[PDB]
DNA sequence: CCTGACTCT
DNA sequence: ATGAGAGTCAGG
């Protein structure tokens, strides 16, 4: 707990040196528009700390920041990125960032701080944020000698931990998936975050006007048809109107009382009208509080932008997760709730949505995984497995998915609500047409237990410690995350190549079109309307061609005036 | 704060 | 026991 540094007040030319570790630092979650508190350099000439009011209004560090040959060093360096952009200063130069490299090695760590990676090294010569920081109400920056020495310690553990970082991703062949792919997506996305996707609240104001007129009258119904007023909301509450008062049987139970899921209610449609009233009922009500309030709740209102932020180092499988708002979970599955995207809309007059997907993508990188000789010449052949297999085609996609990764006899009969019996013939009969995919299921499972972990096509990493576990279910849960991790993280490794693929396409082309949103395995811009033929053909061709697998990549798209029209 | 609901891939 | 990966919401 010894380190001396300079407490700076002005920037000096031996802080603007080539190679340098970077914290700038941001103590709010959401860091979009949000206070930068203070920043640390640490290089070959020694440690310092600066203040942002000082370094960011300095022209030669400002200069600096955005110098590419001047390399940084960072822990979240997207992060960072975005939080100077809406300072209006470009960061540029990221060669090494400890947050992806930590995710990539462990992503079971949940690490999230500079202390927690450096955990990893036994390296403790650093304090977590909580910390330093405190949490909720007391959340606050201390006085400056402790904020200073801690983003300095922050920095000078970036510093030393690099090489052993680096050292043991080369070990594992994963150099390459951190510098090649990971880091240069991180700058693709703080692109996308900061561009955000602009909204049409006049629109989204009067859908919830309706809404709520419609969720009173609903509302009302399911209290005539309960024969009292109660709170449909509450599991707790509904549960005794269904079970209690109007006598309708159980179905399942949680620990802490009867289901009410959608499941359980659909199965309860013989009994009584009611059911499907709640429903619909909770349906309206979601829309109404997640969609519609609270999506307006973090619209900027000046600009009418939303801005999520991408989570990069959070899913256990390589996929990204979308926060505040979650723009991967917007409606689309029904009508009634596929409308609020008729509210995302353009950034500039003129300009249009353009949407692509991956066909089956999932089914596609398996065949190439598991060489199902049948699967992989179904794909040669284009044709179209969930239709074959086949709201028909909807409920037929979760058949395949559900089949390839392991659903059970009781599963499959309860989803499709047919005979259990008739549920596991079905099953036998699926991997009787792809035994290939059957015996990679077997295999991948073994070797899981004699290795410990499981891997991606780009070599991405997941640890099952678990899978050997005595206990069944503990067992089991894991033999199923041997089946399926590999195959959606490799589709997570095929997409995010194909974003940076696609992006040095675009400047390439010298295309005013961008990124606004990923959605697992798909990618969604906007751009303007001249440049749709072009995108036609460029957006596909580059998602197609960003990996080379047995079976051929294929992708849908549509353009048009909203999210909605693409 | 956890649970169980609805939302997506 | 009973495909897997996510986030947000109201209720309690
Ligand atoms: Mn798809």
Same mark, same amino acid.
């Given at each position: =707990? @010894? %380190?001396?540094?300079?407490? +700076?007040? /002005?920037?000096? !030319?031996?802080?603007?040196?080539?190679? #340098?570790?970077?914290? &700038?630092?941001?103590?709010?979650?959401?860091?979009?528009?949000?206070?930068?508190?203070?920043?640390?350099?640490?290089?070959?000439?020694?440690?310092?700390?600066?203040?942002?009011?000082?370094?960011?209004?300095?022209?030669?560090?400002?200069?600096?920041?955005?110098?590419?040959?001047?390399?940084?060093?960072?822990?979240?360096?997207?992060?960072?990125?975005?939080?100077?952009?809406?300072?209006?200063?470009?960061?540029?130069?990221?060669?090494?960032?400890?947050?992806?490299?930590?995710?990539?090695?462990?992503?079971?760590?949940?690490?999230?701080?500079?202390?927690?990676? =450096? @955990? %990893?090294?036994?390296?403790? +010569?650093? /304090?977590?944020? !909580?910390?330093?920081?405190?949490?909720? #109400?007391?959340?606050? &920056?201390?006085?400056?000698?402790?904020?200073?020495?801690?983003?300095?310690?922050?920095?000078?553990?970036?510093?030393?931990?690099?090489?052993?970082?680096?050292?043991?991703?080369?070990?594992?062949?994963?150099?390459?998936?951190?510098?090649?792919?990971?880091?240069?997506?991180?700058?693709?996305?703080?692109?996308?975050?900061?561009?955000?996707?602009?909204?049409?609240?006049?629109?989204?104001?009067?859908?919830?006007?309706?809404?709520?007129?419609?969720?009173?009258?609903?509302?009302?119904?399911?209290?005539?048809?309960?024969?009292?007023?109660?709170?449909?909301?509450?599991? @707790?509450?509904?549960?005794?109107?269904?079970?209690?008062?109007?006598?309708?049987?159980?179905?399942?139970?949680?620990?802490?009382?009867?289901?009410?899921?959608?499941?359980?209610?659909?199965?309860?449609?013989?009994?009584?009208?009611?059911?499907?009233?709640?429903?619909?009922?909770?349906?309206?009500?979601?829309?109404?509080?997640?969609?519609?309030?609270?999506?307006?709740?973090?619209?900027?209102?000046?600009?009418?932008?939303?801005?999520?932020?991408?989570?990069?180092?959070?899913?256990?499988?390589?996929?990204?997760?979308?926060?505040?708002?979650?723009?991967?979970?917007?409606?689309?599955?029904?009508?009634?709730?596929?409308?609020?995207?008729?509210?995302?809309?353009?950034?500039?007059?003129?300009?249009?949505?353009?949407?692509?997907?991956?066909?089956?993508?999932?089914?596609?990188?398996?065949?190439?995984?598991?060489?199902?000789?049948?699967?992989?010449?179904?794909?040669?052949?284009?044709?179209?497995?969930?239709?074959?297999?086949?709201?028909?085609?909807?409920?037929?996609?979760?058949?395949?998915?559900?089949?390839?990764?392991?659903?059970?006899?009781?599963?499959?009969?309860?989803?499709?609500?047919?005979?259990?019996?008739?549920?596991?013939?079905?099953?036998?009969?699926?991997?009787?047409?792809?035994?290939?995919?059957?015996?990679?299921?077997?295999?991948?499972?073994?070797?899981?237990?004699?290795?410990?972990?499981?891997?991606?096509?780009?070599?991405?990493?997941?640890?099952?410690?678990?899978?050997?576990?005595?206990?069944?279910?503990?067992?089991?849960?894991?033999?199923?995350?041997?089946?399926?991790?590999?195959?959606?993280?490799?589709?997570?490794?095929?997409?995010?190549?194909?974003?940076?693929?696609?992006?040095?396409?675009?400047?390439?082309?010298?295309?005013?079109?961008?990124?606004?949103?990923?959605?697992?395995?798909?990618?969604?811009?906007?751009?303007?309307?001249?440049?749709?033929?072009?995108?036609?053909?460029?957006?596909?061709?580059?998602?197609?061609?960003?990996?080379?697998?047995?079976?051929?990549?294929?992708?849908?798209?549509?353009?048009?005036?909203?999210?909605?029209?693409?």
């Amino acid at each position: =707990a @010894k %380190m001396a540094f300079t407490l +700076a007040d /002005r920037v000096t !030319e031996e802080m603007l040196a080539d190679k #340098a570790a970077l914290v &700038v630092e941001v103590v709010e979650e959401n860091y979009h528009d949000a206070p930068i508190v203070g920043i640390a350099v640490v290089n070959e000439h020694g440690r310092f700390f600066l203040r942002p009011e000082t370094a960011l209004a300095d022209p030669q560090f400002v200069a600096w920041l955005g110098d590419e040959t001047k390399k940084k060093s960072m822990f979240d360096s997207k992060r960072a990125a975005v939080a100077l952009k809406w300072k209006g200063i470009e960061l540029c130069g990221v060669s090494f960032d400890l947050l992806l490299a930590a995710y990539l090695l462990d992503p079971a760590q949940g690490v999230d701080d500079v202390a927690a990676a =450096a @955990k %990893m090294k036994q390296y403790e +010569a650093v /304090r977590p944020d !909580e910390a330093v920081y405190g949490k909720g #109400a007391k959340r606050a &920056v201390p006085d400056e000698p402790v904020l200073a020495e801690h983003l300095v310690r922050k920095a000078a553990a970036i510093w030393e931990l690099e090489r052993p970082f680096l050292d043991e991703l080369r070990r594992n062949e994963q150099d390459r998936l951190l510098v090649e792919l990971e880091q240069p997506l991180s700058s693709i996305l703080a692109e996308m975050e900061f561009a955000g996707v602009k909204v049409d609240t006049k629109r989204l104001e009067q859908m919830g006007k309706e809404l709520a007129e419609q969720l009173g009258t609903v509302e009302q119904r399911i209290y005539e048809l309960a024969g009292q007023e109660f709170n449909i909301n509450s599991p @707790k509450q509904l549960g005794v109107i269904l079970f209690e008062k109007l006598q309708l049987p159980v179905l399942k139970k949680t620990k802490t009382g009867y289901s009410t899921s959608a499941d359980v209610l659909e199965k309860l449609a013989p009994y009584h009208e009611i059911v499907e009233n709640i429903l619909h009922y909770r349906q309206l009500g979601k829309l109404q509080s997640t969609y519609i309030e609270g999506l307006l709740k973090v619209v900027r209102p000046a600009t009418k932008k939303v801005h999520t932020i991408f989570n990069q180092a959070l899913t256990q499988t390589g996929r990204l997760s979308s926060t505040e708002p979650n723009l991967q979970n917007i409606p689309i599955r029904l009508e009634e709730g596929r409308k609020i995207r008729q509210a995302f809309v353009p950034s500039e007059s003129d300009w249009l949505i353009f949407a692509a997907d991956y066909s089956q993508i999932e089914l596609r990188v398996l065949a190439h995984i598991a060489e199902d000789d049948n699967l992989m010449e179904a794909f040669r052949r284009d044709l179209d497995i969930h239709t074959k297999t086949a709201n028909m085609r909807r409920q037929a996609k979760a058949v395949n998915y559900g089949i390839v990764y392991g659903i059970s006899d009781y599963g499959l009969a309860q989803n499709l609500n047919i005979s259990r019996k008739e549920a596991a013939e079905f099953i036998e009969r699926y991997f009787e047409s792809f035994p290939g995919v059957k015996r990679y299921m077997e295999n991948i499972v073994q070797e899981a237990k004699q290795k410990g972990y499981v891997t991606t096509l780009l070599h991405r990493r997941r640890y099952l410690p678990d899978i050997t576990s005595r206990n069944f279910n503990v067992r089991s849960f894991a033999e199923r995350m041997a089946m399926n991790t590999p195959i959606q993280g490799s589709a997570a490794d095929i997409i995010k190549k194909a974003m940076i693929d696609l992006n040095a396409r675009l400047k390439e082309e010298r295309l005013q079109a961008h990124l606004l949103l990923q959605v697992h395995d798909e990618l969604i811009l906007e751009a303007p309307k001249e440049e749709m033929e072009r995108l036609c053909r460029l957006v596909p061709e580059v998602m197609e061609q960003a990996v080379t697998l047995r079976v051929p990549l294929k992708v849908d798209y549509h353009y048009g005036s909203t999210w909605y029209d693409a």
